[PDB]
Design a protein around this ligand. Structure first.
Ligand SMILES: *C(=C)C1=C(C)[C@@H](Cc2[nH]c(/C=C3N=C(/C=C4\NC(=O)[C@H](C)[C@H]4[C@@H](*)C)C(C)=C\3CCC(=O)O)c(CCC(=O)O)c2C)NC1=O
Ligand SMILES: *[C@H](C)[C@H]1/C(=C/C2=NC(=C\c3[nH]c(C[C@H]4NC(=O)C(C=C)=C4C)c(C)c3CCC(=O)O)/C(CCC(=O)O)=C2C)NC(=O)[C@@H]1C
Ligand SMILES: *[C@H](C)[C@H]1/C(=C/C2=NC(=C\c3[nH]c(C[C@H]4NC(=O)C(C=C)=C4C)c(C)c3CCC(=O)O)/C(CCC(=O)O)=C2C)NC(=O)[C@@H]1C
Ligand SMILES: *[C@H](C)[C@H]1/C(=C/C2=NC(=C\c3[nH]c(C[C@H]4NC(=O)C(C=C)=C4C)c(C)c3CCC(=O)O)/C(CCC(=O)O)=C2C)NC(=O)[C@@H]1C
Ligand SMILES: *[C@H](C)[C@H]1/C(=C/C2=NC(=C\c3[nH]c(C[C@H]4NC(=O)C(C=C)=C4C)c(C)c3CCC(=O)O)/C(CCC(=O)O)=C2C)NC(=O)[C@@H]1C
Ligand SMILES: *[C@H](C)[C@H]1/C(=C/C2=NC(=C\c3[nH]c(C[C@H]4NC(=O)C(C=C)=C4C)c(C)c3CCC(=O)O)/C(CCC(=O)O)=C2C)NC(=O)[C@@H]1C
Ligand SMILES: *[C@H](C)[C@H]1/C(=C/C2=NC(=C\c3[nH]c(C[C@H]4NC(=O)C(C=C)=C4C)c(C)c3CCC(=O)O)/C(CCC(=O)O)=C2C)NC(=O)[C@@H]1C
Ligand SMILES: *[C@H](C)[C@H]1/C(=C/C2=NC(=C\c3[nH]c(C[C@H]4NC(=O)C(C=C)=C4C)c(C)c3CCC(=O)O)/C(CCC(=O)O)=C2C)NC(=O)[C@@H]1C
Ligand SMILES: *[C@H](C)[C@H]1/C(=C/C2=NC(=C\c3[nH]c(C[C@H]4NC(=O)C(C=C)=C4C)c(C)c3CCC(=O)O)/C(CCC(=O)O)=C2C)NC(=O)[C@@H]1C
Ligand SMILES: *[C@H](C)[C@H]1/C(=C/C2=NC(=C\c3[nH]c(C[C@H]4NC(=O)C(C=C)=C4C)c(C)c3CCC(=O)O)/C(CCC(=O)O)=C2C)NC(=O)[C@@H]1C
Ligand SMILES: *[C@H](C)[C@H]1/C(=C/C2=NC(=C\c3[nH]c(C[C@H]4NC(=O)C(C=C)=C4C)c(C)c3CCC(=O)O)/C(CCC(=O)O)=C2C)NC(=O)[C@@H]1C
Ligand SMILES: *[C@H](C)[C@H]1/C(=C/C2=NC(=C\c3[nH]c(C[C@H]4NC(=O)C(C=C)=C4C)c(C)c3CCC(=O)O)/C(CCC(=O)O)=C2C)NC(=O)[C@@H]1C
Ligand SMILES: *[C@H](C)[C@H]1/C(=C/C2=NC(=C\c3[nH]c(C[C@H]4NC(=O)C(C=C)=C4C)c(C)c3CCC(=O)O)/C(CCC(=O)O)=C2C)NC(=O)[C@@H]1C
Ligand SMILES: C=CC1=C(C)[C@@H](Cc2[nH]c(/C=C3N=C(/C=C4\NC(=O)[C@H](C)[C@H]4CC)C(C)=C\3CCC(=O)O)c(CCC(=O)O)c2C)NC1=O
Lengths: 177, 372, 164, 164, 177, 177, 164
């Protein structure tokens, strides 16, 4: 809905100003890490089925109150939704890393996710722990510091994108809290 | 009326003149959707008889209309062709919607904005976004009724969800195009013993689907969710929030107060001289006409008019950026504080007796129709 | 859930009518069958600790490969997860002998199995090796009556046909 | 039509699944109830001319006003139409005793009765006066078995509850 | 739509005859094999998933012109349709064996089945071969002559049900031909 | 879709002609018997429920083969259809009395009435007889020669509209034959 | 808004899937094209006071009839409104050069043009006279590069084709 290119036009539409040579060089640096951003989205969706299955089982193995009956991840119906429910969060953070700003997941996935989980009986504090594992795994892939799978890249800095994906995973953190 | 085999009418797309009728009803949507396993099964044309196809078309397309036996003969025209196979059940709800029995309980009695929201509730079984309203409200302005019901039945969203043989129903599809679009669908579709006829104003989804933020309230979505998906949370915890809501959803308590229109007023101890908090922001609402000698004259104290928070948004944000160059030549002052201030005599006009003058100092700046 | 009684009171509700003489007629079928299936239910509840031990090891006798590292059963505790992961199914067969239909087996054990066990890489062929090990070990003189062995077998292969 | 068999195979069709153990359990109900209702069919079939001559005039014994000229009974032949107009209902109750459901009663005798009895000005109260005279004349020792008279009464009042 | 009980009433509706003891004894014999019919439908749907996969791979392993490209069962989508298309034929004969007459599948599955398979490009000569295996597999189960799975029953004769389901499996063979 | 006032404008649209003084006196003659037309269709809808119930029962009392089983009006559902089906014929002819031309029923009721009745199994020859009784009862009302019910009117001729109703009721019989 | 990025994201979201290799290959086009249009955007930003003054009066030289009294240009301030009424179009052409698609042109300038310009009687032929005066005065040595010149013209005629 809004990308990083069209974010600077609505800051300039409020002033009715023409975009000129005082802020295009901040957008030309967005082109300068163009392949750096592009390999980072590829590194998340490469191992994305092993991303969410390790993450939601990591939330289960520290809090075994959901597998107890009366828990929200007790039966086989709800865990198939919960394996899906954490995958949509990975499906929309990887959109906003590609688009460049937290606008695509903000009105689509996040506008209305808090009271959906409240009305359905989802333990929200265990959804914080469910997405905090996916924050620590996404920064391990795009800095190539995963212990079980290393991917080949051209060498250089990617730590600006490591703060970028981590700034999206607390946006899903704050909008659920 | 037309032909014993008719897949599509009105020739909107070119590829319906060659399109067959569907030989079998369409499949369910292929995502997981944890809710729909608790839901009842969908009713189609070729699994069920005409006693229950008519009931579920009354339970979904008609809302809960209570059509009598002498009421709705236009539906009895359209149902008598569906039992003869003369039109599909996709075309049948087009004939139900274009009929006057759908018009004389949803179009003339509800509002203009609410008529679109009930059409998404009946035909598509969901609730629209604002951009879906804004493309549907222009068909009610330029093309009218018949073209607006064509926008649902000839859409691709209908034909993928139901096709030609499936009665409309609330389709839980699990992975939605928006997270709002699940729970706005659920809020728009309550269970049994609810109709649309008493709420001539619906007034709650008419202001959640109006602005694109302010997603609706959680107890308004935990209410119509299915069972072993709501329980151990509706014994007495959210249950009083459900009953409090139902006396507000019933009789249409207008959500200026708590939903949108969100003004931190001052506490009641702060003014206390402009007192009696029932009356605190009331003005005379005066109206004059002055036409001939049959034109009435206004007056009916107005209500507590609120700061509208968007006319104070266009004003003071778009303009009053007269924030430029305020060093104002600091002349080694002693303007004994506040500077160029004229005494401003201002004689209240001497109607010969019992009318008198007062004065007051003020800082004076020349206006912008004054340079020339 | 989806019992014999909740089919006939939902289909009467879908038509919008009273319970007719066909709908009272089906519950007379429950009188002839609850004598058979409930004594299969209490035979299961008094023997459930044995039929998950010497019938939960038989999948590991058939699939010894998944005790390897890098597989679905890594350490001792995932095997200790696994007998709990089987005993919930035998609890649901005990929950559907007592209901009369396949109601509590569908949305509690079956609906969602194709998405969990695919994403968690759990092989469903080693589920049905454990279920069909219980199924062919029924007999008339030792276990139950001659007719409860028809019906307790009739819910196990329904679980096999759902997972395969 | 709407029988106990076509309730449990239309509900299985709407869910899109096999005949489960719930649907096989309702058909076991037919083994216990056809020995109640099928001898109520041939007791009706062996006495059908008696129970329309004895009981079709009981409406005329109650309502002798409709044999006034200008009413629904004008001449002799419309009264000969009337015993043909009431043995069809006794044939349909005989058709629903052999089905076991209420299937042949609705679309053959009920569905559209409110349109033909209003427009052709027939009083429906004198219909159910003749039907309820057949209902209260059941007894255990003479007529049929003790359980057949429950079910033969249970189809007659369904015709009363639908026509009124 | 029409069971075995309601089949004799539409023969009686054309004569407007009361059903009596001249043909009720023919209908009481339908209840005499009442548990015999009921165990037969249970024996079909017990091993029903193994019934359809053995039949459709038996159709493949005698005629491998479908697995060749351009064949109708070539790709992974069409084999998943053909595993599903043969299951619906098994799902509707299990209705007709339960209902007692071939009128449940006649207007539901078989109505509109000939012109659908010739407009889509389904080879009808191999669809006869596919349902001929399930004809040979249904009579092996309800006569309990199956070699790899033996089921326990009360002893007796079930040939009168074996000719009934074999009459149903050539009704689908007639409509596709 | 087309009334008598707009029947002359599609004639003059084909010549691209302004409507002139050669034919508006033929249209002012339609307004001259305006109240003569207006009381006639009021006399049709006055005793309209007694019109269809006498006509279809007169169609039954001359031909009792439909009340026989296997007939098309045997059961209770089809008589409520046949009471309704002929009422749609009365409801659309009475539109054409108000419209002045057989256009509103030609496209809405009659366009596709023939092959529906042959696909359903309606004896069309008895449908000639059923609509012919309604032809003779319609001229009995608007010329006030009904024996059982006489209505008061202003005196004059109504034989012009008496030819108008018979021109509509054979248009039904032509498009069903 | 409607960019190359939100085309391949919304189409991947409507299919309900991850960004695949095809969606990553569309963004690789943006490195090859942002060298061309971002030096087309600053040539519009540093010259927008000139190209609304000598391309806003070119409609008035073409259409001197509308400065008559009773027409759409009455006084000096509506002409002062009119240069504002073209300055927003050159801002939105500048907003589409930096985005890369026709995103800010459609819902801010195009969607709504057939309703305002009909009801307020503003002739759109004198709009497109002012835009096509700008379009045919591009050249490769003076104004910009040869590759910015085809795509600065490729947004102006889309404003012409949507207005005409
Ligand atoms: C800030 C730099 C600044 C302003 C904002 C503006 C405020 C201002 N306006 C006036 C005088 C008037 N305002 C009037 C109101 C209206 N005029 C209209 O035609 C419309 C209908 C209406 C709303 C805009 C009127 C009628 C007047 C008086 C006549 C006139 O046109 O001047 C003043 C003058 C107050 C005073 O002199 O005491 C000011 C300050 N001017 C600014 O400088
Ligand atoms: C950060 C997450 C990574 C990392 C990124 C770098 N990538 C660099 C260059 C580069 N990247 C691509 C990937 C992109 N191109 C494709 O064709 C596809 C798939 C279709 C993708 C996803 C390419 C082609 C290149 C080469 C560009 C060039 O060098 O000319 C790179 C070098 C600097 C730069 O070019 O930006 C870096 C640092 N490298 C890392 O070490 C971390 C883990
Ligand atoms: C102009 C005089 C106003 C003003 C108008 C705006 N209205 C906007 C949207 C809108 N308005 C209505 C009410 C009206 N439309 C109807 O269809 C009916 C009756 C059935 C009525 C009374 C509705 C229902 C809507 C929503 C539908 C839609 O948005 O198309 C609007 C758009 C706002 C935006 O999205 O930017 C405007 C500008 N606003 C003003 O400032 C002046 C005073
Ligand atoms: C605006 C040009 C002023 C200014 C105004 C503010 N007033 C604020 C609150 C407020 N004002 C009133 C008086 C008004 N309300 C009435 O009901 C009546 C007559 C009966 C009058 C004259 C009241 C009673 C209140 C408090 C109640 C409430 O706020 O709902 C206010 C808000 C202060 C705050 O919330 O921080 C403002 C800004 N202040 C200015 O700077 C200019 C001079
Ligand atoms: C002062 C603000 C004006 C002005 C006022 C004059 N109005 C005069 C007569 C007049 N005014 C009205 C309209 C008024 N009277 C009503 O009853 C109503 C509605 C309820 C309204 C709005 C009427 C109807 C009349 C009577 C004659 C007519 O129809 O116009 C008037 C003449 C009377 C006098 O000399 O006092 C004056 C002076 N005129 C001005 O010059 C200033 C700007
Ligand atoms: C106008 C006919 C003169 C002229 C005037 C200018 N005065 C400027 C600033 C200024 N003027 C005053 C005096 C005035 N303000 C008061 O408050 C009082 C009495 C209480 C008086 C008499 C003051 C104090 C100031 C400084 C504060 C301010 O900047 O507003 C001025 C602006 C100069 C600048 O912006 O640098 C002008 C042009 N100048 C002229 O040429 C004619 C003769
Ligand atoms: C002097 C520069 C004038 C002028 C002044 C005179 N005014 C006389 C009488 C008079 N003046 C007013 C208006 C004045 N009195 C007030 O109370 C108020 C404010 C409320 C004002 C503005 C009134 C009402 C009157 C009395 C009217 C009457 O009774 O006729 C006056 C006569 C002598 C006196 O009364 O002082 C004079 C000379 N007259 C001029 O010719 C120049 C222009
Ligand atoms: C019937 C098929 C055979 C038969 C088999 C034998 N089973 C033997 C031991 C055994 N069986 C079971 C399962 C049984 N217990 C249950 O609670 C249920 C169902 C709920 C079943 C089917 C177990 C757990 C065991 C282990 C020891 C025990 O508890 O008996 C057995 C002895 C040798 C062996 O251990 O394999 C035989 C021969 N027995 C028969 O007589 C008929 C022929
Ligand atoms: C059971 C309620 C009573 C009882 C009542 C009596 N019925 C008497 C005679 C009777 N009943 C009929 C109709 C009869 N035939 C049938 O096939 C059926 C039901 C399917 C019924 C109800 C007729 C025509 C007659 C009169 C002559 C005849 O028997 O055919 C009766 C004799 C006196 C009278 O009412 O005429 C009695 C007492 N009989 C009983 O024993 C229990 C108490
Ligand atoms: C024919 C395909 C079979 C076969 C059938 C026989 N079944 C006999 C008796 C019988 N069958 C059932 C099964 C049915 N009842 C249920 O409760 C359920 C599941 C809920 C099912 C599926 C029962 C209860 C009975 C006992 C009835 C009784 O004997 O009183 C049987 C004996 C004669 C008869 O009762 O009809 C036969 C021959 N046996 C075979 O050998 C073939 C393979
Ligand atoms: C012809 C089929 C009839 C018949 C018709 C005549 N009607 C004459 C006059 C007339 N008719 C009406 C009826 C119409 N007007 C209404 O207001 C309403 C209901 C709301 C209806 C249905 C009126 C008012 C009039 C009076 C007009 C007048 O005379 O000024 C009439 C006399 C000649 C003429 O005016 O056209 C005739 C012949 N009379 C018959 O005998 C047959 C049955
Ligand atoms: C009665 C005088 C006739 C006769 C009537 C029957 N019509 C039957 C079904 C049917 N009829 C129509 C035509 C009617 N319905 C319409 O909607 C319109 C125009 C808008 C008209 C003229 C249709 C379309 C249908 C099919 C819909 C349905 O079946 O409900 C019918 C039922 C046949 C049956 O199922 O047994 C009857 C008996 N048939 C006759 O024999 C006499 C001549
Ligand atoms: C390229 C097509 C020709 C060419 C044309 C000439 N243009 C002349 C003056 C002139 N040109 C423009 C528009 C230009 N400036 C811009 O900022 C932009 C777009 C961002 C464009 C297309 C303007 C506004 C003017 C007026 C005066 C000025 O600022 O230069 C010109 C001189 C004669 C004249 O005034 O027409 C020519 C010949 N020039 C070339 O060399 C190639 C052949
Ligand atoms: C065997 C059974 C049998 C019947 C049911 C009737 C039915 C019937 N009525 C009429 C003929 C008619 N039917 C009517 C109808 C009516 N007159 C009224 O005043 C009422 C409003 C309405 C009846 C409720 C009228 C007005 C005529 C014309 C002749 C007349 O005036 O009686 C005709 C002949 C049609 C014709 O003229 O071609 C027939 C068959 N006749 C029969 O032979």
């Amino acid at each position: 809905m809004l990308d990083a290119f069209s974010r600077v036009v609505v800051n300039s539409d409020a002033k009715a100003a023409y975009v000129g040579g005082s802020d295009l060089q901040a957008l030309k640096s967005f082109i300068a890490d163009g392949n750096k951003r592009l390999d980072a989205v590829n590194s998340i969706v490469s191992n994305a089925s092993c991303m969410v299955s390790d993450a939601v089982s990591g939330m289960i193995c520290e809090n075994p109150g959901l597998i107890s009956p009366g828990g929200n991840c007790y039966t086989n119906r709800r865990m198939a939704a919960c394996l899906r429910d954490g995958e949509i969060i990975l499906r929309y953070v990887s959109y906003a890393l590609l688009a460049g700003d937290a606008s695509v997941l903000e009105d689509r996935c996040l506008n209305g996710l808090k009271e959906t989980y409240i009305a359905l009986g989802v333990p929200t504090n265990s959804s914080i722990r469910a997405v905090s594992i996916m924050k620590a795994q996404a920064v391990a892939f795009i800095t190539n510091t995963a212990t079980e799978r290393k991917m080949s890249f051209a060498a250089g800095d990617c730590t600006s994108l490591a703060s970028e994906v981590a700034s999206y995973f607390d946006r899903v953190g704050a909008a659920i809290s | 009326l037309t032909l014993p085999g008719t897949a599509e009418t009105n020739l909107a797309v070119p590829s319906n003149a060659v399109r067959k009728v569907q030989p079998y009803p369409i499949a369910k949507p292929p995502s997981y959707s944890s809710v729909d396993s608790l839901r009842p099964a969908r009713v189609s044309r070729m699994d069920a008889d005409w006693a229950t196809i008519y009931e579920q078309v009354r339970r979904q397309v008609m809302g809960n209309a209570y059509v009598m036996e002498g009421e709705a003969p236009d539906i009895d025209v359209a149902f008598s062709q569906l039992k003869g196979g003369n039109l599909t059940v996709r075309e049948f709800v087009r004939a139900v919607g274009k009929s006057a029995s759908y018009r004389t309980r949803f179009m003339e009695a509800k509002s203009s904005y609410n008529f679109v929201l009930l059409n998404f509730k009946h035909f598509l079984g969901r609730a629209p976004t604002q951009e879906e309203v804004s493309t549907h409200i222009q068909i009610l302005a330029t093309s009218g009724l018949e073209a607006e019901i064509d926008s649902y039945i000839d859409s691709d969203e209908y034909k993928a969800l139901f096709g030609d043989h499936v009665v409309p129903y609330v389709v839980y599809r699990g992975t939605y195009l928006s997270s709002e679009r699940f729970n706005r669908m659920v809020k728009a579709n309550p269970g049994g013993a609810t109709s649309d006829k008493a709420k001539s104003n619906l007034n709650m989804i008419a202001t959640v689907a109006a602005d694109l933020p302010t997603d609706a309230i959680d107890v308004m979505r935990g209410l119509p969710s299915p069972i072993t998906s709501e329980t151990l949370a509706f014994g007495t915890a959210y249950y009083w929030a459900k009953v409090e809501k139902e006396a507000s959803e019933g009789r249409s308590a207008s959500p200026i107060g708590e939903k949108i229109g969100k003004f931190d007023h001052a506490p009641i101890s702060t003014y206390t001289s402009l007192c009696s908090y029932d009356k605190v922001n009331k003005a005379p609402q005066i109206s004059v006409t002055n036409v001939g000698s049959d034109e009435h004259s206004y007056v009916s104290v107005t209500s507590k008019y609120i700061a509208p928070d968007m006319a104070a948004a266009a004003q003071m944000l778009a303009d009053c950026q007269k924030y430029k160059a305020g060093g104002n030549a600091p002349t080694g002052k002693w303007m004994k504080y506040y500077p160029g201030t004229t005494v401003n005599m201002a004689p209240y006009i001497s109607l010969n007796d019992t009318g008198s003058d007062s004065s007051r100092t003020v800082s004076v700046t020349l206006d912008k129709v004054k340079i020339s | 859930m989806k019992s014999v009684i909740t089919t006939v009171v939902s289909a009467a509700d879908a038509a919008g009518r009273f319970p007719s003489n066909s709908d009272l007629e089906s519950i007379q079928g429950n009188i002839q069958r609850s004598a058979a299936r409930l004594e299969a239910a209490e035979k299961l509840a008094g023997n459930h600790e044995a039929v998950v031990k010497e019938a939960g090891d038989a999948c590991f006798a058939k699939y010894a490969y998944l005790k390897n590292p890098g597989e679905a059963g890594e350490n001792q505790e995932k095997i200790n997860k696994c007998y709990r992961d089987v005993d919930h199914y035998m609890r649901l067969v005990n929950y559907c002998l007592v209901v009369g239909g396949t109601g509590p087996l569908d949305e509690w054990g079956i609906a969602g199995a194709r998405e969990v066990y695919r994403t968690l890489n759990l092989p469903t062929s080693a589920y049905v090796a454990s279920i069909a090990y219980t199924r062919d070990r029924l007999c008339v003189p030792r276990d139950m009556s001659a007719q409860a062995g028809v019906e307790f077998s009739a819910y196990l292969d329904y679980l096999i046909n759902a997972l395969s």
